[PDB]
Amino acid sequence: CGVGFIAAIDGKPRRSVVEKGIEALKAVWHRGAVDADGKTGDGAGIHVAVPQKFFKDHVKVIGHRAPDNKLAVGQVFLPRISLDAQEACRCIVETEILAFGYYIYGWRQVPINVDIIGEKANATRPEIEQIIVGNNKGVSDEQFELDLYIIRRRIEKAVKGEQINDFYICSLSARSIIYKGMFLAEQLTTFYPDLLDERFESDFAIYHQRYSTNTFPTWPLAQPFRMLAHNGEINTVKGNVNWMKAHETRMEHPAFGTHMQDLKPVIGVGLSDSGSLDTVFEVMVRAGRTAPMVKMMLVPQALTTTPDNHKALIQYCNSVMEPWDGPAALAMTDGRWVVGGMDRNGLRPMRYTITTDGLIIGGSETGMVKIDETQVIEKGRLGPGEMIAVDLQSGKLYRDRELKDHLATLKPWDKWVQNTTHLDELVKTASLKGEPSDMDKAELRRRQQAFGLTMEDMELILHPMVEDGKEAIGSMGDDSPIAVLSDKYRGLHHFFRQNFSQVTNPPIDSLRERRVMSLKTRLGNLGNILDEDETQTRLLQLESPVLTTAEFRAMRDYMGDTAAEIDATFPVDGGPEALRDALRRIRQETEDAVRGGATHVILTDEAMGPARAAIPAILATGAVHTHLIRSNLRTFTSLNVRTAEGLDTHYFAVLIGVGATTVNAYLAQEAIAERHRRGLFGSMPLEKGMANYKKAIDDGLLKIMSKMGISVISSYRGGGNFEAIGLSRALVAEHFPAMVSRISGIGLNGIQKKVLEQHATAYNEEVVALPVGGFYRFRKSGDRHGWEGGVIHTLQQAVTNDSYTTFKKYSEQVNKRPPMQLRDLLELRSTKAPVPVDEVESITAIRKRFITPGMSMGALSPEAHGTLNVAMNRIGAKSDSGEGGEDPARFRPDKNGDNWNSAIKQVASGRFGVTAEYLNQCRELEIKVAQGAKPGEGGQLPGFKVTEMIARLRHSTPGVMLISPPPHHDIYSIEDLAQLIYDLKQINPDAKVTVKLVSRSGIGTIAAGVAKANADIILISGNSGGTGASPQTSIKFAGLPWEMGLSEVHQVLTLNRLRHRVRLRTDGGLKTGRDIVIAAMLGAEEFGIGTASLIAMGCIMVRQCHSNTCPVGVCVQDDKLRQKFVGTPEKVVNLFTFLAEEVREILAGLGFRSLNEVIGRTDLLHQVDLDLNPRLAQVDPGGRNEVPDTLDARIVADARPLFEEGEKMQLAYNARNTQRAIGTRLSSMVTRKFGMFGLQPGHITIRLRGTAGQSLGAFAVQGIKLEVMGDANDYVGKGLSGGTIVVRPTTSSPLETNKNTIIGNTVLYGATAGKLFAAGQAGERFAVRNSGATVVVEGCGSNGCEYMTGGTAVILGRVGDNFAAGMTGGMAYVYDLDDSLPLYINDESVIFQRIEVGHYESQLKHLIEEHVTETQSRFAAEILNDWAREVTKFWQVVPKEMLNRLEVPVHL
Ligand SMILES: Cc1cc2nc3c(=O)[nH]c(=O)nc-3n(C[C@H](O)[C@H](O)[C@H](O)COP(=O)(O)O)c2cc1C
Ligand SMILES: CS(=O)(=O)CC[C@H](N)C(=O)O
Ligand SMILES: O=C(O)CCC(=O)C(=O)O
Ligand code: F3S
């Protein structure tokens, strides 16, 4: 994959612009899935100017006369198999161009060579044909495209009405034309020779290859699109899409004249995300807005450093259009400008070079197209939010600032912005004036009972919010029933699961990166995206959809005649259809209101009473919002909800994203008060009370959002980002935005019945106390759980006394209950007579398919951890190190023969103990993208668990907390995954690689991509798995059952013929023989067993894993407490032995003599309402994935002496952007023979001219040194491990070392040792997570030194926003010539001072010296020359938590 762009700064056409454009496309294949087929690829494209010589001649050769104007071309994919349709297609195409009365010189079959296409693709190949049009009407450049645009839509529309498939017009303008198709980019020129003609000349270019979650090639989905080309993904798409359904309700502009209606819907069916973007971007530009304005209105930068002009503008946009978020490198152009742009988080690479010849070449990597250093005038990149551009009419280049300057210039942004009413202060005022409360406990209690609330609810969850202003953290998995199956009133919000993101895009850090996020809310800002007038700022604005009963009324008053209140409630005397008609009613009443003139709606349960049940706020909000959309009305109101049932963060999230503008949990502020008048909060005023509550819910949301990288509530709102488990298809469709509900579930009639039942509970008689509740924990009360006391005892009894009979009694205890989980709804019947048990496969055999999941050293006691490693190795199975290091002492068997080393090592966001030697002490690497306990997010390890041993392991700082970054920093998109897997397979030639993913609908597809990315195993984790520490909403609301995700992967992978390329594993609550058989039949080959293995080691399931108070030594770092541990290998081994025997017992009954004979065999399962079909369906009823060599292949060959004799060596080689992971293999080899540190620095040194591609020197141990004279791309020294890497411009380059980029992003991610020197600037997230590498570099993008925990980080230059966020431990100095660092640095955990002590001043000096020595850097050398005055300019950045720990104090 890639996007790229090229432009002649002067405006004047050239052939090289196209030849370069090809050139690029020939250097991206190293980033894609190569087929063994040699031909098949996902899509490539080049968007250049229609070449008027070439075309005109053509018209001449047929013997017409060339017009004076520009001649248009339509580039069109016709149906290729039904001639009947091609015609219909061409009549339509002609008719439409005809009624605008332009002129047709006529069709031209495009030459192409289908030999380089694969069959899959030739299959779906359309018939490519050009049609040539002339501007007989003598209109203007601008009018021609405008008209053509209305024409293309007209066609597009008619073909649709005709119901014609496969028709598609890539381009149809007289400025631009697109040559895209499904074939390898390196072969664009082969499939389309026109491109090789010298008449193809052009002032600009835009190329793009693409990847996919597929094996199927659609042609129209290859890019570039008509104005756009996108690398990334736009996670906020359904959000955007539904907004347009309303944005459109009002869009009207005069340029389309009477055409608008043909103009809608601007987004047709079947578009890819980017495709939909281009769609919108286009209309906007067709109506007048420049390119750069549009990038902004749609992919605005974050309004955190910023001039005030810009801020105005931004604020303007944000008020018109809600962003289109997701990682995004974009290459754009309206007719005149050409733009390179970034998403608001700089999520994708985008280097660029400027030449003496007056060209700019935009890129994704950098070595992408030869250019002589000699003619380089600059070497840049884009950072979050920036653009760079060219105005081809004036042949002027604008860098970000200067370009943004320009747009600020266009209008009185501020004066206009000043037109908004921020009703904030007005609202805060009334709160301080006193959050009221008007119910008597006798009431609170009874309503509360209506929505089935409890003490656990009040104590466990509400309280901490009020107190700490933070939400409840907890531990152990979610073992309760899944709500539909529940026995006990659960509220709608229970069935909506929060979606989150896995490999497609990364989730954000809402702590360390809160500045880019946002919760602004606006009532009445929905008018003409098409307009550009100040009247667009006239709207009210909150800063949280969240309102305390005080603030709420504040607002509701300011509104007034303008608001309308709808009674979300229904009679109980009602009848079987009570709630239905209720839902109609509300729907209608809101209609009338809005029509009637109303501008705000207030939906509410307030009139709930003994005679009226409340309509489930969630259902009521959706029913309303949707119908509102469905009648083009939502654009006229704000929709605000008052809910008695609301209480936690989740409930807000759902409400909001199913419509809600504003929410007020009124009966909870109440419940807060009552608590407060028994002084449960102590001194603290009820007002500060709410304040906190509110922050907890605000950060609440910001989080839930970040789980699918979304930075902003307006796109999130109404986007329906949930998945419904349990409610009926029909329903979910009827009333909420689009969401999946893969098995229908209950419907209104059930909902009604349950709502009312709980109701009687609370108005049928007195209520002094809520029940206790046993949702977050087993009480011997109502809610059941998997793990309950009896069950735990019996199991313990069983593995301790070693009786299989006791085991069997446990599992029976377990299997004889009411269904609690989906698998529980299946029977296993077969058609074979039974077989004798002896005959089946053996336990030895079976238990080997079992593994003990990754549970970190930290989360668990050292004793527990190694216990597990011993058990697994004893029975020839495998265990998983876990998110947190593994001690290397452990790399040998002990006198007793026991083996503490673990067979599968993880690799997760904060790369904990990740070392060349760690990565090499195993048979398998598990890329942890996610756990079912907390999908969207990333591990926690409370500070008081960060023992010293722990801290030593992890290179973290003692007793300081370890919260991990939710996304991996080197996996922002699937190609990214792809490359990690490559490095992984490079540093360790023997291991298989796994990808831990978490079930959720859509996993299937990703699953595929993972497969194309060379993963060997894929593991789908259930929603219910365990965690040592994790917020409770994720434990109860993120994730989906494995029975759904595991089949989906089984199916989809099968459906694309990849299902044999990868092995499948699953975990999530598997405690029993049958749980394991059923998982096999659904497709699994391996099963993971954690918690139950913990319980055998003794866990009693008391849930204080986060607390460091383990009654039993399982999950606790405390010494005394660790002495109460009685786990034993022998115990765990017994657990597995039983499990397998119980598996064999079952297979025999089924007539099978082995597990393999039953994988995938879903015909053996019958579901004994929900629709379990989609899970049972069969698609077609009736070593390791190896990888390509790299430079290392030769380097190694050339190093015989190294390994053979010990010699020292110096090698030289060129290097291209296309060579990845250079050295890594070397490193694996060296680490294996001499170990990370048995070689003295520089022992084997390899100079490289040119460009290093991703992962340069990744995992290099000491002894290796790489000099890259030239430059590099992302991830230099990723996981650096005591090796050394240096990078400087070519002796001959005339560039100013420090004013130019030289290495990409996420450099030194997670390193632990070694040095890195860089004559130049580095891009985003430099030194992220560095845990002990020393570096020197002349500058650095934003988010630098983030989450760093060790090492020294010098920095000869300016530094990006949010520097040092979460930087708990190492140190960075920072030459700052403008005393600006103050404006960029992220305070929170760090401080800066000028050097005072002189050993710190000396430390710096020596590095900088090294730097120079290695890099021959002038600018550096000069700082050395004026040390005196200069030292004065740096700034010591030192972590708070490091102040008292530091041998030599930093002060005095
Ligand atoms: C205490 C504990 C620690 C865990 N630590 C990790 C971890 O370090 N890395 C990881 O990728 N998943 C981790 N997990 C999840 C397990 O690896 C596995 O996905 C899940 O535990 C199995 O769920 P089951 O508990 O119902 O047996 C942890 C889970 C628990 C309960
Ligand atoms: C190379 S790419 O993976 O960024 C593809 C981009 C886009 N989401 C698409 O489906 O075309
Ligand atoms: O130990 C850690 O860093 C993480 C452990 C974890 O996140 C979990 O077990 O839920
Ligand atoms: S608190 Fe974890 S619950 Fe198991 S580990 Fe101790 S009993």
Swiss-Prot record:
Q: Which GO terms describe its molecular function?
A: 3 iron, 4 sulfur cluster binding; glutamate synthase (NADPH) activity; metal ion binding
Catalytic reaction list: 2 L-glutamate + NADP(+) = L-glutamine + 2-oxoglutarate + NADPH + H(+)
Organism the protein comes from: Azospirillum brasilense
**Region described as Disordered: spans on this chain:** 877-898
Keywords of this entry: 3Fe-4S, Amino-acid biosynthesis, FAD, Flavoprotein, FMN, Glutamate biosynthesis, Glutamine amidotransferase, Iron, Iron-sulfur, Metal-binding, NADP, Oxidoreductase, Zymogen
**What further note is attached to this protein's record?**
Glutamine binds to the large subunit and transfers the amido group to 2-oxo-glutamate that apparently binds to the small subunit.
Family recorded in the similarity comment: Belongs to the glutamate synthase family.
Cofactor: record remark: Binds 1 [3Fe-4S] cluster.
- Keyword Flavoprotein part of the UniProt annotation: yes
Q: Quaternary structure?
A: Aggregate of 4 catalytic active heterodimers, consisting of a large and a small subunit.
Q: Which PANTHER family match?
A: FAD NADPH DEHYDROGENASE/OXIDOREDUCTASE, GLUTAMATE SYNTHASE (NADH)
Is Methyltransferase found in the keyword set? Answer: no
- List, from the UniProt record, the residues annotated as the active site of this protein: C1 (for gatase activity)
- Show the ranges annotated as biased composition (Basic and acidic residues): 887-897
Question: Would you kindly state one Gene Ontology biological process term found in this protein's UniProt entry?
Answer: ammonia assimilation cycle
Q: Which residues bind [3Fe-4S] cluster?
A: C1099, C1105, C1110
List each copy of the Glutamine amidotransferase type-2 domain by range.
Answer: 1-393
Disulphide bridges, residue numbers: none
Q: What is its EC number?
A: 1.4.1.13
- State the name under which the record lists this protein: Glutamate synthase [NADPH] large chain
**Cofactors (names):** [3Fe-4S] cluster; FAD; FMN
Q: What class of enzyme is it?
A: oxidoreductase
